[PDB]
């Protein structure tokens, strides 16, 4: 996740990492991913196991 | 924690470990105790 | 408690203004099914008219609140 206190020092190689065919995330994208885990369907899934 | 290799693990790393694991388990435990003291069994808290 | 997720003793002792039932987990889902099943059948011009009590409660409901004014 580009831009955090835990990863900021690595923004400069994110482009090459992506050239390998991998995806880096902005903080907005990662937050959207995480909020995906609070939808009713995933919430019910978590209550299952 | 930057530049702290195996032999540098000291006070700061122990405190960071407390924050990022031990007190997270304690926070889960505290929520469990509050919910059970009130007999709440059907409203679970999702921990991310 | 087992069937509808509320204690009658609690209502008698404390008389709450509002009471929320939570349908979380397996027990919550069973209680929600109990709520969903019950109905208010009636006869209209010599014909059955099966209504449903708790029209707000469906299979996507996570809670239900009983309301009142003073208890």
CATH code, domain carrying C30? 6.10.60.10
Cα B34 to Cα C70: distance, rounded to the nearest angstrom:
27
Q: Do A40 and C60 touch (CB under 8 A)?
A: yes
**CA B39 distance to own-chain centroid:** 23
A38 to chain B: closest CA residue: B46
- Cα A37 to Cα B15, B27, C56: the distances in Å are 29, 20, 25
Quoted resolution (Å): 2.1
Method of elucidation: cryo-EM
Q: Check: CB of residue A37 under 8 Å from CB of residue B48.
A: yes
Q: What tokens does B43 get?
A: 């409203």
User: Where in the sequence is the domain holding C58, given as residue range(s)?
Assistant: 17-70
* Buried/exposed C29-50: b ≥16 CB within 10 Å, e otherwise: eebbeebbeeeeeeeeeeeeee
CA distance C26 to chain B (A): 8
A37 dihedral zone (left: phi>0; alpha: psi -120 to 50; beta): alpha
- Cβ neighbors of C31 (< 8 A, separation 6 or more) are B42, C3, C4, C5, C21, C23
Question: Measured between CA atoms, how close is B19 to chain C, in angstroms?
Answer: 30
Q: d(Cα C1, Cα C34) in Å, to the nearest integer?
A: 12
């Amino acid at each position: 996740t580009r831009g955090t206190g835990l990863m900021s020092a690595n923004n400069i190689i994110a482009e090459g990492i992506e050239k390998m065919g991998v995806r880096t995330f902005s903080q907005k994208e990662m937050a959207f991913n995480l909020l995906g885990l609070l939808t009713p369907e995933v919430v019910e899934l978590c209550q299952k196991s | 924690e930057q530049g702290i290799e195996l032999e540098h693990i000291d006070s700061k790393s122990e405190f960071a470990h407390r924050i990022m694991l031990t007190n997270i388990l304690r926070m889960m435990g505290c929520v469990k105790k509050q919910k059970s003291a009130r007999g709440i069994e059907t409203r679970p808290a999702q921990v991310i | 408690k087992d069937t509808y997720g509320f204690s009658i003793l609690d209502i008698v002792i404390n008389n709450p203004v509002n009471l929320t039932i939570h349908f979380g987990g397996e027990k919550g889902k069973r209680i929600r099914e109990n709520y969903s099943a019950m109905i208010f059948e009636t006869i209209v011009d010599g014909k059955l008219k099966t209504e449903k009590i708790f029209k707000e409660i469906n299979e996507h409901s996570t809670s239900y609140t009983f309301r009142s004014e003073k208890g």
